[PDB]
Amino acid sequence: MIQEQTMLNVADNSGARRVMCIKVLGGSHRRYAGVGDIIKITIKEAIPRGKVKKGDVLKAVVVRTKKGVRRPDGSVIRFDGNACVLLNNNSEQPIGTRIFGPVTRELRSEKFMKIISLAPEVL
């Protein structure tokens, strides 16, 4: 996330409990992520009927930061916790069909029509 390791919350029907950031993407000589950022996750748990199994490495994007997230006005949606939606590891858009808990309104783009049309928040 901002540091090396970082467990953060499952955001899809893909797994269970926590899943681990191994790296940030979208540059190098990075330790730390920006607001708009893409994270690299290993599934540190999994669920038997999920899309994935323990220790498989996939791509992901931010849905909560415990600091808070911002873009349009610079105003923050400030959360209880960090959480991450997995992407396809090369082919983009989410892999899970449900978001679990609240979302930002900084995610509102064509490549995210999948995750924002869900009912728990920002419809």
Partner 1 sequence: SNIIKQLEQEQMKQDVPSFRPGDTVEVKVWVVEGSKKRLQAFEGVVIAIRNRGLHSAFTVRKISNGEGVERVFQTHSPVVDSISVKRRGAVRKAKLYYLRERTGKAARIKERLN
Partner 2 sequence: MIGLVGKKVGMTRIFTEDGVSIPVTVIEVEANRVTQVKDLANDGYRAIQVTTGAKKANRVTKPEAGHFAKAGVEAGRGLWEFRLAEGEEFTVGQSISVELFADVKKVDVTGTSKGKGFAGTVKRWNFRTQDATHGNSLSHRVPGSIGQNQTPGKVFKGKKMAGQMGNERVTVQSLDVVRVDAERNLLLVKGAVPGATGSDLIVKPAVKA
Q: Return the half-sphere exposure (C-beta side, CA atoms, 13 A cut-off) of residue 69.
A: 25
- Among positions 50-109, residues that touch RNA (CB under 7 A) are 54-55, 57, 65-68, 70, 74-76, 78, 81-82
The distance of closest approach from Cβ of residue 74 to partner 2 in the complex, given in angstroms and rounded to an integer, is 6
Q: Give the DSSP letter of residue 113.
A: H
**Contacts (Cβ under 8 Å, ≥6 apart) of 45:** 10, 15, 16, 17, 18, 19, 54
- 26 interacts with, out of RNA, partner 2, partner 1, none, CB within 5 to 8 A per kind: RNA
- 27: its two tokens: 């540059």
- 47 interacts with, out of partner 2, partner 1, RNA, none, CB within 5 to 8 A per kind: none
Binding partner 2 (rule: CB under 8 A), the pick from 73, 90, 119, 123 is 73
Q: Return the half-sphere exposure (C-beta side, CA atoms, 13 A cut-off) of residue 45.
A: 16
In the complex, the residues that contact partner 1 under the rule CB under 8 A are 64, 68, 72-73, 75-81, 101-102, 108, 110, 120-123
